[PDB]
Design a protein around this ligand. Structure first.
Ligand SMILES: O=c1ccn([C@H]2C[C@H](O)[C@@H](COP(=O)(O)OP(=O)(O)O)O2)c(=O)[nH]1
Lengths: 229, 239
């Protein structure tokens, strides 16, 4: 996943954040993001049957898991931006604090697959809670993208689709969104070079799909275009 | 107090044995770290922490009590299973947090405002992460005296509800939890408030007053005498 792409993603988030409160980056604090990443991580974990003593038989909600990975991605990028000392990660590692199932370089040994299995997920997403602990949003974004790759979940497709809907809502939905992501590939939306062509294809599939008359779009694609930096 | 605190950890042992007898063997220190992480998030969600939402509704403080009793259950558990400069270097790091002794440097009061609650239990999670259940327990008691509530009492009440639940299909997904509006735990208030704080902490009395609470909760759930035997027997042995 090319850095260029990672940067672009954050731009869009900044757009999203701006609409809700245009002074987010002054008012808002690095510690809020870390909080929100901690809660939605918990939220994700609660979709799995981790409680040894409660409905032990419960089937996992891998759908909700996917939509939670994205919910977290929003807060992560928001903290990434906002964060604009290092040997503090490896320090926690030797302290053996980060954890593992009882059975980028630097962040792979904290992720545990397949995410479809409970212990592997619990491990993984507690380790996001910890990366957050110490404000490492950048690795939580890279981690979230891994989670999704393991889950065969086209996360940045879905993030752009969902971004473009928010655009409409200023000027079952989920089912339509996932359908727009299809018109465009996984390899495509990440491939440095073609990616901004491909994100524009998704955007445009959303607008059509929802019914943004061609005529009200004169500026819809603007920030998206500016997201190339 | 002191034998009371021992007496608490013994009950915790019996509750966990009720769930799986070979628990110390099948459980793992990280199971308890997780457990505390989640009941800490469920406590924090109580509070209007979403800057992007309605802050106006009142924080349900009575609910907080019960989620504090629940964390306590988990740290007693943690402490039991687990058989300095680590911590102060983490403090240096920036690994703990603040709103905008080694223990009362990560608790922030009053627990009544969103912000101080958020730092406090964010740091309770951070603690559970390095498996310092010892400091969690103690912060929980510290927290009970800021909220001016009867932790030991609530612990015993929830302890006994935790049993009722298992006997009523909880592990199997078939328990009646909410009944016309009202959830499980809400029942636990009038129960513990039936006895005094003084009473639950006296080094002679106390086990009598805990047996009182136990019994109140069982009466709420209308239970036969035979199903109260695991709890009444662990409350005896607790001496
Ligand atoms: O091995 C265990 C597992 C759970 N609990 C107790 C602790 C706490 O009091 C409660 C948490 O259970 P819950 O299902 O999360 O209930 P609630 O929704 O009321 O918070 O269960 C134990 O004591 N021992």
């Amino acid at each position: 996943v090319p850095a260029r792409v990672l940067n672009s993603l954050a731009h869009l988030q900044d757009g999203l954040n701006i609409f809700m409160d245009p002074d987010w980056r002054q008012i808002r604090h690095v510690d809020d993001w870390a909080l929100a990443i901690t809660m939605e991580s918990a939220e994700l974990i609660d979709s799995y049957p981790w409680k040894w003593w409660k409905n032990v038989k419960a089937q996992t909600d891998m759908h909700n898991v996917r939509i939670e990975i994205a919910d977290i991605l929003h807060f992560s990028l928001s903290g990434e931006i906002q964060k604009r000392d290092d040997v503090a990660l490896k320090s926690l590692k030797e302290m053996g604090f980060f954890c593992r199932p009882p059975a980028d370089d630097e962040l792979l040994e904290l992720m545990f697959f397949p995410l479809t299995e409970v212990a592997s997920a619990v491990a993984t997403f507690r380790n996001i809670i910890q990366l957050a602990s110490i404000y490492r949003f950048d690795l939580i974004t890279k981690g979230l993208l891994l989670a999704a790759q393991d889950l065969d979940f086209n996360l940045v497709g879905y993030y752009v689709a969902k971004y473009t809907l928010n655009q409409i809502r200023q000027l079952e939905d989920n089912e339509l969104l996932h359908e727009c992501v299809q018109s465009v590939s996984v390899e495509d939306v990440l491939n440095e070079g073609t990616y901004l062509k491909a994100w524009e294809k998704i955007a445009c599939s959303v607008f059509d799909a929802f019914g943004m008359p061609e005529e009200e779009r004169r500026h819809a694609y603007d920030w998206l275009k500016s997201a190339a930096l």
